[PDB]
């Protein structure tokens, strides 16, 4: 069942993030980001009842909170990535430990010519879309392709120093949340040509706000964490039409300053 999860790996942000985290804007309020990430953890863990493994902040790694970038997980198989940003590679160490406690099958992307961000991987439930970006390359998607054999993998040129999931993400089975920008619409279509099947599409006015979290919770159903009507009111209005979804607005303004979206701050795990 798509978007069904039992666990989630997250990680506390270090104080060094406000000043030291890679980006591309306002000064970051660390107190505010702190809070926001707390709320974010509670929605998944307290409100939604997933077992959360919280990793401790490594001050040394100001980007460490964005855990999605370091691992892709599908069924019982963990891909531990080789992040495009050289400096962020020391964040895999601590994630591999955790994914080992979860008794998950590990594969490490060690190939020295292979970069891959999890931020660049869209998993539709039916297949894989990997974005070819400034951080994820051919040699990485091929290894991602090689790790998840039961699934078809195809690559979508993502430009402009972004990621694939900066303008899209799954908002339900067969439903792909999508930005209006011509960048996104382009990849969107590029994506469909390549599928053995047609996806439904949820379009939203703000590229960033098409990054959301869909979940299939036991005795809850469709669940979507999405950006607030404050941050992105015209996109919130679009999510508001999803009347089969338990809609939980989740703010993420601070982290966005450093290119942090909703999906980046967790790795989701379905366990028997
Ligand atoms: C999430 N996945 C957003 C980009 C990919 C959709 N990752 C944010 C990472 C933010 C760090 N500061 C970085 O620059 O890697």
Environment class of 56 (CB within 10 Å of its CB; exposed 0-12, middle 13-18, buried 19+): exposed
CATH topology of domain 1-272: 3.75.10
In angstroms, what is the span from residue 243 Cα to ligand 1's centroid? 30
Do 27 and 224 touch, CB atoms closer than 8 A? no
Header resolution in angstroms: 2.5
Distance CA 179, CA 114 (A): 28
Environment class of 209 (CB within 10 Å of its CB; exposed 0-12, middle 13-18, buried 19+): buried
Query: Which residue has the least CA distance to atom 7 on ligand 1?
Result: 264
Q: Establish whether 74 is an annotated binding residue.
A: no
C-alpha radius of gyration, the chain, whole number: 17
In angstroms, what is the span from residue 69 Cα to ligand 1's centroid? 7
Residue from 13, 163, 209 whose mutation best tests the ligand 1 pocket (most atoms within 8 A of CB): 163
Q: Is 67 helix (H, G, I), strand (E, B) or coil?
A: helix
In angstroms, what is the span from residue 37 Cα to ligand 1's centroid? 15
Closest atom of ligand 1 to 166 CA is: 6
Do 54 and 10 touch, CB atoms closer than 8 A? yes
Listing DSSP states for 77-121 in one string gives EEEE---SSGGGGGGHHHHHHHHHHTTPEEEE---TT----GGGE
Distance CA 28, CA 19 (A): 8
Give, in degrees to the nearest 5, the angle at Cα 180 between 193 and 197.
Answer: 25
**CB hemisphere CA count around 70 (13 angstroms):** 26
Residue from 10, 25, 66, 156 whose mutation best tests the ligand 1 pocket (most atoms within 8 A of CB): 66
**From which experimental method does this structure derive?**
X-ray
Q: Which residues line ligand 1 (CB under 6 A)?
A: 21-22, 63, 66, 68-69, 85, 117, 119, 163, 165-166, 258-261, 263-264
Do 263 and 34 touch, CB atoms closer than 8 A? no
In angstroms, what is the span from residue 64 Cα to ligand 1's centroid? 10
């Amino acid at each position: 069942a798509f978007g069904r999860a039992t666990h989630a790996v997250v990680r506390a942000l270090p104080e060094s993030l406000g000043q030291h985290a890679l980006r591309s804007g306002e000064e970051v309020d660390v107190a505010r980001a702190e809070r926001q990430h707390q709320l974010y953890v509670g929605v998944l863990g307290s409100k939604l009842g997933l077992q959360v493994v919280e990793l401790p902040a490594d001050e040394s790694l100001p980007d460490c909170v964005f855990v999605e970038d370091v691992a892709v997980v599908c069924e019982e198989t963990a891909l531990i990535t080789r992040p495009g940003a050289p400096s962020r590679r020391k964040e895999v160490d601590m994630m591999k430990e955790a994914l080992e406690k979860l008794q998950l099958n590990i594969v490490e992307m060690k190939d020295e010519n292979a970069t891959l961000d999890g931020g660049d991987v869209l998993f539709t439930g039916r297949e894989f879309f990997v974005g070819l970006s400034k951080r994820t390359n051919q040699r990485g998607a091929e290894i991602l392709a090689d790790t998840f054999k039961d699934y078809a993998v195809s690559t979508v040129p993502v430009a402009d120093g972004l990621h694939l999931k900066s303008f899209c993400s799954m908002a339900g089975p067969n439903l792909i949340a999508i930005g209006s920008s011509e960048s996104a619409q382009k990849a969107l279509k590029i994506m469909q040509q390549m599928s053995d099947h047609r996806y439904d599409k949820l379009t939203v006015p703000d590229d960033i706000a098409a990054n959301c979290i869909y979940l299939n919770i036991p005795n809850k159903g469709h669940v979507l964490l999405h950006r607030t009507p404050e941050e992105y009111p015209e996109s919130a209005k679009v999510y508001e039409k999803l009347k089969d979804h338990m809609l939980i607005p989740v703010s993420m303004s601070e982290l966005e300053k450093v290119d942090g979206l909703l999906t980046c701050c967790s790795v989701l795990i379905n366990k028997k």
